RNA sequence: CGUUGACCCAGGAAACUGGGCGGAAGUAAGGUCCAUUGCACUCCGGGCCUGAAGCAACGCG
């Protein structure tokens, strides 16, 4: 059950593994500071998070069209699976 | 590690206190093998190899 309901942050999986933690920070900013103000990345390669970002945006609205753009997008050989966060991040709560 | 300073944050009328901020450390980070598809924000799986830096200057290790 993908998460649906709108958020100010997106979810990301599925991504490559290998890239080093700035690498990945700059890149994703790259990609999606397009859609609106980005008031955070989360990126860590511990075990549990490893292959997933969180990218925190000021408006809802650039969440979503930041979502529904760049989804399934290759990013590093790899599709981006993108939902909202379950939960808000702590800067927007 | 010391001294004398710079700048940012919290508090304080101020003096100043606490942190950011130095030998930190075999740490952060990195390469590889294995493992892991994972909703977090207080870092952080395991093996082998490698490996830094406070913001300035001097001094000392
Ligand atoms: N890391 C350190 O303690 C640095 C000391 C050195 N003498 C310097 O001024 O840079
Ligand atoms: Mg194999
Ligand atoms: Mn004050
Ligand atoms: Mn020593
Ligand atoms: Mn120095
Ligand atoms: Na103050
Ligand atoms: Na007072
Ligand atoms: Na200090
Ligand atoms: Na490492
Ligand atoms: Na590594
Ligand atoms: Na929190
Ligand atoms: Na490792």
Redesign the pocket.
Known sequence: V??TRP?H?I?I???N???????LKKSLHAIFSRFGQIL?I?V?????????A?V?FKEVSSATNALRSMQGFPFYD?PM?I???????????
């Open positions: 993908p998460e958020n942050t979810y999986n599925n991504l593994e290998k890239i080093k933690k700035d690498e955070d989360l860590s390669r511990s075990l549990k998070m490893r292959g997933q969180f925190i790899k699976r939902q909202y966060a379950k939960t808000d991040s702590d800067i927007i709560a």
